[PDB]
Design an enzyme around this catalytic site. Structure first.
Site, short mmCIF file in Angstrom:
data_model
loop_
_atom_site.label_atom_id
_atom_site.label_comp_id
_atom_site.label_asym_id
_atom_site.label_seq_id
_atom_site.Cartn_x
_atom_site.Cartn_y
_atom_site.Cartn_z
N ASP A 118 0.78 -1.31 -0.01
CA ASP A 118 0.07 -0.04 -0.13
C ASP A 118 0.92 1.04 0.12
O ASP A 118 0.66 2.12 0.80
CB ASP A 118 -1.04 -0.11 1.19
CG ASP A 118 -1.89 1.09 1.14
OD1 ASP A 118 -2.32 1.51 -0.13
OD2 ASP A 118 -2.83 1.12 1.98
N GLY A 156 -7.71 11.01 6.30
CA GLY A 156 -7.05 12.02 5.77
C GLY A 156 -5.56 12.01 6.23
O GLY A 156 -4.99 13.06 5.75
N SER A 163 -3.42 8.95 6.35
CA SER A 163 -2.57 8.32 5.80
C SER A 163 -1.52 8.97 4.93
O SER A 163 -1.75 10.04 4.04
CB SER A 163 -3.49 7.56 4.73
OG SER A 163 -4.31 6.60 5.29
#
Ligand code: ZN
EC number: 3.4.22.-
Length: 199
Positions: free
Chosen positions: A100, A156, A158
């Protein structure tokens, strides 16, 4: 039909989390109108400073963190998009959906955090609202919030950093771990995993 097909926009730096003084605070460097245009052209003439950038797409706003000359963020926020720069859209230097994780060359003028060598487990999460949340590391890729909060507070964030006590980069915040909408722990990409990707 093919002639009418649009293209994905560029990620745009819209601000930063200032950590250079005794007080952490968010600064906005571009409003929504400029962000929209910059996303479509991929050309951003703004001067970039600091280690933690706030970035937006058409849909989302999250964080990007410079570590050893690479601006890192999460794939589930940026996907495969380019990032806008003074010379045009810049192609991702790293793309790993399994971690990711994505990354671009750090913008000229940015400052990079140093990967942590301490082995410490007392960590600090920097949020998009300039919160510095204490986090106890519980594994290679997870830490527990000393004071759990609603997930809203971490939305928000990440791509933001988890920091050692000395300010080293320990990991990239990936996603919260929640129960009934309450974030009790966080999962992050360890910096060692970034260094390996970097060779
Ligand atoms: Zn350290």
């Amino acid at each position: 039909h093919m002639a009418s097909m649009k293209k994905k926009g560029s990620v745009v730096i819209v601000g930063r989390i200032n950590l250079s003084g005794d007080t952490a605070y968010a600064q906005q460097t571009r409003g929504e109108e400029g962000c929209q245009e910059t996303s479509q052209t991929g050309r951003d003439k703004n001067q970039v400073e600091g280690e933690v950038q706030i970035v937006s797409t058409a849909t989302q706003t999250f964080l990007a963190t410079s570590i050893n000359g690479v601006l890192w963020t999460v794939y589930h926020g940026a996907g495969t998009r380019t990032i806008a720069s003074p010379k045009g859209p810049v192609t991702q230097m790293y793309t790993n959906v399994d971690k990711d994780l994505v990354g671009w060359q750090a913008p000229q003028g940015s400052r990079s955090l140093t990967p942590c060598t301490c082995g410490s487990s007392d960590l600090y999460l920097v949020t998009r609202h300039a919160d510095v949340i204490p986090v106890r590391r519980r594994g290679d890729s997870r830490g527990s919030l000393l004071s759990p909060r609603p997930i809203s507070y971490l939305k928000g964030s990440s791509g933001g950093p988890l920091l050692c006590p000395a300010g080293h980069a320990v990991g990239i915040f990936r996603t919260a771990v929640c129960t009934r909408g309450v974030a009790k722990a966080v999962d992050f990409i360890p910096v060692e995993s970034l260094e390996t990707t970097m060779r």
